[PDB]
């Protein structure tokens, strides 16, 4: 595990962690929406507003987690191009010197 391989591993993981956070936020938007209905039926309008605020927060949070996951993925793609072309450059440099 090279230094750049270690970094690549960490970045690929951060992207997955963010993607999971967006899924959890999407799941909890659905769960909070279900609680607004139950609260409206019981006429608990103060509890309904607390769940409405949670649902809108979880919705908007998920878009943020999702977009940052996209960004960290793009970076990790580029670091993969650097890890592989670094290996190829080393091997070519070795072929060049053994044939010399």
């Amino acid at each position: 595990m090279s230094n750049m391989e270690k970094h690549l591993f960490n970045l690929k993981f951060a992207a997955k962690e963010l993607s999971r956070s967006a899924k959890k936020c999407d799941k909890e938007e659905k769960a909070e929406k279900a609680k607004i209905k139950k609260a409206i039926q019981k006429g608990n309008m103060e509890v309904a507003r607390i769940h409405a605020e949670n649902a809108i927060r979880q919705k908007n949070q998920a878009v943020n987690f999702l977009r940052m996951s996209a960004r960290v993925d793009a970076v990790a793609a580029r670091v993969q191009t650097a890890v592989t072309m670094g290996k190829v450059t080393k091997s070519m440099a070795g072929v060049v010197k053994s044939m010399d």
Binding site: I36, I56, R57, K59
Partner: protein, 84 residues
């Protein structure tokens, strides 16, 4: 013995203090909640919360409008306090 080391005047004081201290804790939690509210303000726009409440009310058949803001004895006594 016990009624000496904790007499009524000292209980009076302890109770007063207990009451007043939980008032300060209520002041404290309000300002913590206000701070979190503004910190995360762009994650909960007002208009989006109002529209979700309206949607949920319409689906429940509840005749209420969620974008707008929503006793007699107190008003009578207030008028007496004005009239005096």
């Amino acid at each position: 013995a016990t009624l000496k080391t904790m007499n009524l005047e000292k209980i009076s004081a302890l109770m007063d203090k207990f009451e007043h201290q939980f008032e300060t804790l209520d002041v404290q939690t309000q300002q913590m909640e206000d701070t979190v509210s503004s910190t995360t303000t762009l994650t909960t726009p007002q208009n989006q919360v109002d529209m979700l409440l309206q949607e949920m009310a319409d689906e429940a058949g509840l005749d209420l409008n969620m974008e707008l803001p929503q006793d007699e004895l107190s008003q009578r006594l207030a008028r007496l306090r004005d009239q005096v």
